[PDB]
Amino acid sequence: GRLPACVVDCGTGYTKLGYAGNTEPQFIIPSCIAIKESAKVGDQAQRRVMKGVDDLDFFIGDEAIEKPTYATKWPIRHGIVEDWDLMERFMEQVIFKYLRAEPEDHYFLLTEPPLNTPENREYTAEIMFESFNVPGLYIAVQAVLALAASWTSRQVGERTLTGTVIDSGDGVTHVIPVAEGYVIGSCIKHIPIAGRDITYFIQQLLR
Amino acid sequence: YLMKILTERGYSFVTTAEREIVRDIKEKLCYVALDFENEMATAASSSSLEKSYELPDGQVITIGNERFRCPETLFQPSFIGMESAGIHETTYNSIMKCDIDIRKDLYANNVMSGGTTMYPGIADRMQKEITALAPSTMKIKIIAPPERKYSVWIGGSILASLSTFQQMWITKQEYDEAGPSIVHRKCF
Ligand SMILES: Nc1ncnc2c1ncn2[C@@H]1O[C@H](COP(=O)(O)OP(=O)(O)O)[C@@H](O)[C@H]1O
Numbered sequence: 001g002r003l004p005a006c007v008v009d010c011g012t013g014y015t016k017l018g019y020a021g022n023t024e025p026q027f028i029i030p031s032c033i034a035i036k037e038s039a040k041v042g043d044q045a046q047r048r049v050m051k052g053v054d055d056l057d058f059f060i061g062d063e064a065i066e067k068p069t070y071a072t073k074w075p076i077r078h079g080i081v082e083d084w085d086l087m088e089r090f091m092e093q094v095i096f097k098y099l100r101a102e103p104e105d106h107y108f109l110l111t112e113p114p115l116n117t118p119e120n121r122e123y124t125a126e127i128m129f130e131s132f133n134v135p136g137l138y139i140a141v142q143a144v145l146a147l148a149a150s151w152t153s154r155q156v157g158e159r160t161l162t163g164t165v166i167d168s169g170d171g172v173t174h175v176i177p178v179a180e181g182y183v184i185g186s187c188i189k190h191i192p193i194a195g196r197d198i199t200y201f202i203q204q205l206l207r
Numbered sequence: 208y209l210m211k212i213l214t215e216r217g218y219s220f221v222t223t224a225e226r227e228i229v230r231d232i233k234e235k236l237c238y239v240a241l242d243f244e245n246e247m248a249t250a251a252s253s254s255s256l257e258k259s260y261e262l263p264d265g266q267v268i269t270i271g272n273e274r275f276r277c278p279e280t281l282f283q284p285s286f287i288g289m290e291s292a293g294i295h296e297t298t299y300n301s302i303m304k305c306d307i308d309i310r311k312d313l314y315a316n317n318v319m320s321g322g323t324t325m326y327p328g329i330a331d332r333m334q335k336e337i338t339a340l341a342p343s344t345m346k347i348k349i350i351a352p353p354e355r356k357y358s359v360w361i362g363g364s365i366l367a368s369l370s371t372f373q374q375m376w377i378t379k380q381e382y383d384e385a386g387p388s389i390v391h392r393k394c395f
Pocket residue numbers: 010011012013014015168169170171172195196
């Protein structure tokens with residue numbers, strides 16, 4: 001009766017959520033996060049410093065859109081993140097409220113864009129090991145996960161490791177080939193245009 | 208009001224071009240009076256106060272009491288019929304509504320700006336009125352920089368040059384997301 005680990009696919013757009021050993025991602029919510037910020041002017045020497053318990057007085061998810069007194073502030077921007085405190089707040093909120101998983105007795109796998117710099121991964125892993133005290137961690141590119149999921153298209157029993165994946169994203173779509181399990185490192189290119197700027201152009205023309 | 212009084216003198220101005228002409232006339236030949244009654248009495252002896260201005264057509268207009276009459280409307284809004292108080296009274300009320308301790312600091316520092324406060328002697332009249340209204344036990348100082356016309360622009364430039372303000376701006380990602388109700392929340 002070993003406990004299942006936890007599966008999370010963070011990103012700029014709708015963040016997928018759910019548990020392992022299951023055939024449907026139970027929770028699919030945006031990255032929108034609320035905060036009790038307002039209009040101070042001293043905002044570059046005390047970003048927030050919320051007095052008392054007001055620091056955690058913020059919602060998350062689809063319920064966070066319909067709160068018209070705070071600020072909807074997306075933490076992610078095509079992989080790279082400016083301030084990761086909002087990311088930590090979102091992670092704690094999800095793990096506790098939605099997943100309800102104790103980090104000390106669970107394994108977390110995280111996904112990041114291939115262009116993510118080493119510093120961000122190092123510091124997020126440090127944050128996890130320090131605060132959540134997760135026994136185990138693992139981060140890998142999302143291309144191989146897509147290749148594994150592609151087997152369901154037809155003839156799952158027929159092993160087919162070779163191929164290539166061009167994945168989409170809210171702010172990034174990448175190209176990654178697979179050669180019998182081993183990918184090519186130098187044959188990877190990052191595309192900045194994605195499914196968000198398209199909507200920007202749509203609205204700009206429509207206005 | 209200056210147009211209305213210039214009518215009482217004998218000179219008529221209605222259209223907008225003469226509005227600009229009267230604006231220039233006020234900008235060039237207007238000043239405030241320390242004492243209204245004394246100035247009126249000296250005007251009764253009108254032999255040293257009248258001044259002449261040259262119109263574009265060449266006509267010459269002589270202006271007497273109107274030089275120190277229109278500015279007094281600021282201290283006497285009843286002239287135009289407005290049921291309000293003068294700038295001195297409003298500033299006194301505003302300072303009184305503040306906390307007692309900060310009243311001393313507010314009295315010690317009184318910055319003024321704008322294009323309507325360049326009339327010579329305005330600072331002296333304001334100081335006299337405030338000291339008369341305020342208790343006569345402290346010191347009231349009026350600061351009148353000679354470049355108050357562009358003070359707002361200079362302050363805006365300095366604020367923009369500030370390093371800390373480089374992040375307080377409002378970007379377009381912001382607006383891509385919601386009707387500009389965002390101007391208020393923030394950016395204020
Ligand atoms: N059926 C669809 N038609 C058009 N665009 C879609 C559709 N489904 C998703 N999208 C777009 O793809 C984006 C989400 O792709 P996704 O990769 O899941 O975001 P992320 O990079 O965080 O994983 C959305 O911004 C959305 O605009």
